[PDB]
Amino acid sequence: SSPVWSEPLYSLRPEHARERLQDDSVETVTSIEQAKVEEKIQEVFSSYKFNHLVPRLVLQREKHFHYLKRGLRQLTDAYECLDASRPWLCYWILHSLELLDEPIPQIVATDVCQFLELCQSPEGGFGGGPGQYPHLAPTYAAVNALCIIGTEEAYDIINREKLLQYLYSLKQPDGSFLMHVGGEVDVRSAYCAASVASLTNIITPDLFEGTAEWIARCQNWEGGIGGVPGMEAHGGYTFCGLAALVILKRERSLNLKSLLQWVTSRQMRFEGGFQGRCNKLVDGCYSFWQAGLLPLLHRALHAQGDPALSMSHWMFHQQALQEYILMCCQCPAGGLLDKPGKSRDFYHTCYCLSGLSIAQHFGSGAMLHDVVLGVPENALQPTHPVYNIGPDKVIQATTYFLQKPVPGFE
């Protein structure tokens, strides 16, 4: 073996150079862009190697913490474009802090609860800010944020009776859901609805009638899932689709074989990170949307009695993903990002960290196997693959709400 102060990396092996793009001497916009990213990434990788000396990689926890702590209270006008997504900012930041095991002061927690209460609509659901119409995306974010806080104060903010009525007000006869009244339809809505309904215990027999079938129609020839039937497979929509089906216990409605082959193919042989769709670029946020699909598929196949499943690893290159996130997605000033050259933002900070946690932790049944690349302190808290909040938070919230009746239903 090697001394504790040097840790060989997959991305630094001499044979890794063979993984560079082969454009077959036929250049198109796609290959040109891919080659540009690979050139930059190789430069980054090389900066972490000093011949046979390869220092352990470090997650800059403290820098990330200070960036997050500041954002939770105030934001520059650069975030005016997210004025209709305030609950998302709460969730992204709180989940990042949770992954980093950084305590949330009680005062700050109460202030977040009060703010989300102001975003809650009298018709049920939460809007992007005080007085805004409710929308399933901020509703999903608000519920997740309240569950991360996990106090009875936070749980009780949610008006469950109106929330269920609101979900009914968005339900379509073909099984799909509108994102908001008079709004668009895509797989994101099914997941947002399934996530908040299961956590708050408001699922009725008919709420999701036809939903599983509609989601299956979104799986396409590629194996992944598109936003609506007929559309290109995309990691974001595929995560939403599979996670929703897992909540509904209808994963078998999909061709899991083609889905598995599709997502594993989305990990970039050279960069180590994941792309959102075939022939597009690597991006740190897909560390969650794409890689998060492996724990879901593992669970789904394990429920089916698959005798070939691993008892120690997810079906993606866990080490290579950690290498991509740690070497290429950290902003030296704190925060994480899409790829070198891009600026940090709270959204990428949330998902790059969520993906890193998934890559470090394997769990199935009574089996637990951790693979924490770099210094030991890099280990993050685990995240639930369905909800993307701590597993402890999921259990605590589900248990709390299971003690309440389904609004006006028996």
Binding site: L21, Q22, D23, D24, T28, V29, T30, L72, R73, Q74, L75, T76, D77, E80, D83, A84, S85, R86, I107, V108, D111, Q114, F115, L118, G127, G128, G131, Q132, Y133, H135, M179, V181, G182, G183, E184, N220, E222, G226, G227, V228, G230, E232, A233, S258, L260, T264, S265, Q267, M268, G272, C278, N279, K280, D306, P307, A308, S310, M315, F316, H317
Partner: protein, 315 residues
């Protein structure tokens, strides 16, 4: 009338025609979180938007105000919803609104609200005449814009405009054969017109795809389409394909070709093929080659496939 960046722009709090209504500030609570330090202009427009919304004022001034609110944050879906309420209530010229959304999407093509607004207008007018050309212009700037392709599929299916889409697909594939959004549109068009059961159509597609593969052997999209149009009937149902790929292996031993062979072997074993032991041995050898040398990023997947094959066909 006057844009937010125009030299003569005046804050709403200073407009005489707006003096009769009090602005409604946003209440973020006494101890704010994720508080955005808005510019004076941003806050001014939204304080008045909140006022007209709270009063549910269906007026021409409210309608013009939404235009500025949208310029400040086109992702504010509440503003868009209210603007649509006003369009109906004021009986606004929808063709003029179409010219408006056209300009807005050109500026912010990756926004969900703008594409949905356009769809609603097209639905209200039952007029798709400008759609294919407009979308084509958006795709000329970003050939992979997801929202544009989604809107394009909706228009084509809702108004049955299939006649020239395969020709459009062919042109875009000529420009960039690696454009996965275009291969997806190819499947979309064929499955919804002739279908793939017509053996003449299937042969044409398999031939076309194989030609693209020979031209650009490492383009994953073509390989994925080839598998996509053959997978449901079963890859083992096409014996000649195996031979052709086997002949191209010695000169094009790419991970895509090797993986495709494993996929064929998997299906063959699932269908009581002849020489089962030999096929299983060949598949396991390729899984090892993929895991250790040719496609190591997917070592865990290939090892799983190897174990899976043994659990299903060892005997």
């Amino acid at each position: 009338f006057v844009s937010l960046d125009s030299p003569s722009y005046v804050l709403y709090r200073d407009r005489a025609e707006w003096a009769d209504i009090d602005p409604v500030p946003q209440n973020d609570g006494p101890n704010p979180v994720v508080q955005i330090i808005y510019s004076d202009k941003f806050r001014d427009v939204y304080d008045y938007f909140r006022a007209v919304l709270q009063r549910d004022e269906r007026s021409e001034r409210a309608f013009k105000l939404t235009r500025d609110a949208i310029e400040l944050n086109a992702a504010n879906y509440t503003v868009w919803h209210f603007r649509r309420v006003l369009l109906k209530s004021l009986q606004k010229d929808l063709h003029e609104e179409m010219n408006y959304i056209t300009a807005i999407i050109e500026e912010q093509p990756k926004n969900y609200q703008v594409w949905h607004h356009r769809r609603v207008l097209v639905e209200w007018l039952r007029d798709p005449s400008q759609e294919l050309e407009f979308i084509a212009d958006i795709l000329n700037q970003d050939a992979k814009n997801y929202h544009a392709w989604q809107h394009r599929q909706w228009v084509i299916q809702e108004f049955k405009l299939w006649d020239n889409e395969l020709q459009y697909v062919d042109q875009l594939l000529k420009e960039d054969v690696r454009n996965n959004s275009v291969w997806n549109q190819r499947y979309f068009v064929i499955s919804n017109t002739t279908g793939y059961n017509d053996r003449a159509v299937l042969e044409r597609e398999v031939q076309y795809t194989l030609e693209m593969i020979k031209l650009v052997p490492h383009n994953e999209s073509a390989w994925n389409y080839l598998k996509g149009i053959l997978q449901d009937r079963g890859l083992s149902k096409y014996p000649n394909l195996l031979n052709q790929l086997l002949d191209l292996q010695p000169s094009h031993s790419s991970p895509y070709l090797i993986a495709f062979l494993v996929d064929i072997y998997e299906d063959m074993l699932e269908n009581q093929c002849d020489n089962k032991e030999d096929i299983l041995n060949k598949a396991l050898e390729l899984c090892e080659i993929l895991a250790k040398e040719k496609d190591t990023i997917r070592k865990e997947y290939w090892r799983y496939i190897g174990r899976s094959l043994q659990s299903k066909h060892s005997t």
